[PDB]
């Protein structure tokens, strides 16, 4: 009778067809994504045109449900995201050739590989190849090399594509009613009439900006101190005040200076906080890192992994005769179904992947009961920072000593506390002003700040600016260095990491005051805490029920980002540093350059 | 002090096998990739076969492929060369070398090692 009753009969139509729709298009994906085939393909992308038409139909069938005369909260979300157009604004020709383009830059970062010039047949191809290079590598020319061929080989490809892509993207946009295609990704934090829970698009950039202010002082203090250990490391070739050079920051961006550890660690001859080389010592494989992994969620009040994550999950590379896209993935395919894709090495790395993907299924396997389109993270933040929650925990000294991984006769000094924190600033603290510049850059280039004439010169101007990292060879716009990192060629909004990372020391400072945790924050671990289990389960059965504003507060006191605990768990390296560099230069100068002479 | 010392070298028939065996010091043994050469009597020094740091991805010259096989154990720090079906062609004197970086596409030739073995005579009779 009333539109609310008749929104509500849709929604259960909605709720009802989606069941198999979607578990159809996911079992799919998954048998593709572990057994890439072109049967399996075209399967893949038969069962996802299902689903997309379902929801292009189930869409437009919301639309005569208008929001404003909607009381219940719950019904009205749902609405809310249903009736989003999205890519079906585009004329046939344009969704055809927007995914065309989509398609062809996702191949092109999957297959693109670098070749000797003298032997073609001798290639290498991003993962494992190039990027084995660019985490173990110790020499300059080596590093330079897969670094420039992977911009020069298939960077230059993406170009093209890019260029087509933001036309499009625009386009799309703009006829959503959206400033640009950046605008449009800011939508995701935008909260409406909810007194005192708002939140405006525009907000995301000021709150983004303000915080990065208070996280540069670190930063800067964390870059100074890497130059010093960097050009003991590559004598040579970094200057005292410039920026770094590209190439030698660890990984094949530097997204991470996570491998940066073996170069820079503070105290060399403490026993290593980085226990990579005691789970290969203890003969550990991925069994063993995904059973410790689920005996951690246990621990907190949460429940063991599914008999169907234990069957259908892969673990491990199948590698020979059966190829999978090894990227770490959380698969939740409803119908109760829930499965991990990751190929474990035995590494420090994929021990904490293994607890940040688990804590993603924790999540999905939580909020299961919602309404299928409220189980999702309150904002694209929402599930990396859960994930990271477990690593912060997983990752400690007390937490690995206690799992074996480290000796029952390990003393806590204070030097492993500066050991610690410092591996931890490398990967969180690192990849902040990344973060930052990455979507600056594409947010002003979907605005139309950015001339294609000066993509790259812009590109190069901010990362020497913002990052403090200077490109080693000279680029000019034949070149698409953002696209030749996974999110700028596949499409997906990068805020989320910079937003997750404060999220996670706001949710882990109200974790471990649940868990009456004395001392630093750095110093605690959830584990066998089933409070803080608690407080975390509330947040994570309820979806996107309510909005992230207020979901954010319900567990820790504010309905906005913060960077203050962030900031007081590095605060023991951050004076530590500062003595350091002491003598030190503590900035960085734009002008000067690998090549310059 | 980086030292590399093979072992394994003697006199074989042919189509015998014989595996040369290298031992190398130093910490940071799995950050580099290591490689095998040999020099005829009267010849020049040229490439054999290059495995990763990792142990993940090996390469071989054309004479070699598909009867010789580069191994490393990270773990014991040593670089292993199975020699399958011998020739009297493969008479030369055997060195393991140390490359400056982690890759087999890279570290081929010997501008790119800096750390040699003192050598290993192997010799294959008709």
């Known amino acids: 009778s009333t539109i609310e009753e008749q929104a509500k009969t849709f929604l259960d139509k909605f709720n009802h067809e989606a069941e198999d729709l979607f578990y159809q298009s996911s079992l799919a994906s998954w048998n593709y994504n572990t057994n890439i085939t072109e049967e399996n393909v075209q399967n893949m992308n038969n069962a996802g045109d299902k689903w997309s038409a379902f929801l292009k139909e189930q869409s437009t069938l919301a639309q005569m449900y208008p929001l404003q005369e909607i009381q219940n909260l719950t019904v009205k979300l749902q609405l809310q995201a249903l009736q989003q157009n999205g890519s079906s604004v585009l004329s046939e020709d344009k969704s055809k050739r927007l995914n065309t383009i989509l398609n062809t830059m996702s191949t092109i970062y999957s297959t693109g590989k670098v070749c000797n010039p003298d032997n073609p047949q001798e290639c290498l191809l991003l993962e494992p190849g190039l990027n084995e290079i660019m985490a173990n590598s110790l020499d300059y020319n080596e590093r330079l090399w897969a670094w420039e061929s992977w911009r020069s080989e298939v960077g230059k490809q993406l170009r093209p594509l890019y260029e087509e892509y933001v036309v499009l993207k625009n386009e799309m946009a703009r006829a959503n009613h959206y400033e640009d295609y950046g605008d449009y990704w800011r939508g995701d934090y935008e909260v409406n009439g909810v007194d005192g829970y708002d939140y405006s698009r525009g907000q995301l950039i000021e709150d983004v900006e303000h915080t990065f202010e208070e996280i540069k002082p670190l930063y800067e203090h964390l870059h100074a101190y890497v130059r010093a250990k960097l050009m003991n490391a590559y004598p040579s070739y970094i200057s005292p005040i410039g920026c770094l050079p590209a190439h030698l920051l660890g990984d094949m961006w530097g997204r991470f200076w996570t491998n940066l550890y073996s170069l820079t660690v503070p105290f060399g001859q403490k026993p290593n906080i980085d226990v990579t080389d005691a789970m290969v010592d203890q003969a550990w494989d991925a069994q063993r890192i995904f059973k410790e992994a689920e005996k951690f969620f246990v621990s907190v009040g949460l429940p063991n992994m599914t008999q169907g994550f234990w069957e259908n999950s892969m673990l491990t590379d199948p590698g020979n005769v059966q190829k999978a896209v090894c990227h770490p993935t959380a698969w939740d395919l409803g119908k109760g179904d829930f499965r991990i894709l990751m190929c474990t090495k035995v590494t420090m790395d994929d021990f904490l992947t293994a607890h940040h993907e688990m804590g993603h299924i924790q999540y999905d396997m939580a909020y299961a009961a919602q309404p299928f389109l409220l189980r999702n993270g309150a904002n694209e933040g929402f599930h990396e920072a859960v994930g990271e929650i477990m690593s912060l925990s997983a990752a400690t000294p007390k937490h690995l000593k206690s799992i074996g991984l480290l000796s029952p006769d390990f003393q806590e000094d204070n030097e492993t506390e500066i050991n610690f924190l410092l591996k931890q600033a490398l990967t969180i603290v690192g990849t902040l002003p990344f973060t930052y510049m990455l979507e600056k850059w594409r947010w002003m280039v979907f605005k139309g700040e950015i001339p294609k004439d000066q993509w790259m010169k812009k590109w190069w101007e901010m990362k020497r600016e913002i990052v403090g990292v200077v490109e080693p060879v000279p680029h000019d716009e034949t070149y698409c260095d953002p696209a030749s990192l996974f999110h700028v060629s596949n499409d997906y909004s990068f805020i989320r990491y910079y937003t997750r990372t404060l999220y996670q020391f706001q949710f882990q400072e109200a974790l471990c005051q649940a868990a009456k945790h004395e001392g630093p924050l750095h110093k605690c671990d959830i584990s066998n805490s089933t409070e803080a289990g608690q407080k975390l389960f509330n947040m994570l059965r309820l979806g996107k029920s309510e909005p992230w504003t207020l979901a954010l507060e319900n567990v820790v006191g504010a309905k906005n980002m913060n960077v203050r605990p962030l900031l007081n768990y590095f605060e023991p390296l951050f004076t530590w540093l500062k003595d350091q560099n002491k003598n030190s230069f503590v900035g960085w100068s734009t002008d000067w350059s690998p090549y310059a002479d | 002090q980086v030292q590399l010392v093979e072992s394994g070298g003697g006199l074989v028939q042919a189509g015998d096998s014989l595996r040369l065996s290298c031992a190398a010091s130093?910490?940071?043994?799995?950050?580099?990739?290591m490689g095998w050469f040999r020099q005829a009597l009267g010849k020049e020094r040229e490439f054999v076969a290059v495995?990763?740091?990792?142990?993940?991805?090996?390469y071989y010259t054309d004479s070699v492929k598909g009867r010789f096989t580069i191994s490393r154990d990270n773990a014991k720090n040593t670089v292993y060369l199975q020699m399958n079906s011998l020739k009297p062609e493969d008479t030369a004197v055997y060195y393991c070398?140390?490359?400056?970086?982690?890759?087999?596409?890279?570290?081929?030739?010997?501008?790119?090692?800096?750390?040699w073995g003192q050598g290993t005579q192997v010799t294959v009779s008709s």
């Open positions: 495995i990763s740091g990792s142990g993940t991805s090996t």
């Open positions: 130093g910490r940071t043994f799995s950050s580099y990739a």
């Open positions: 070398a140390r490359a400056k970086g982690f890759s087999t596409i890279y570290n081929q030739d010997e501008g790119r090692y800096d750390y």
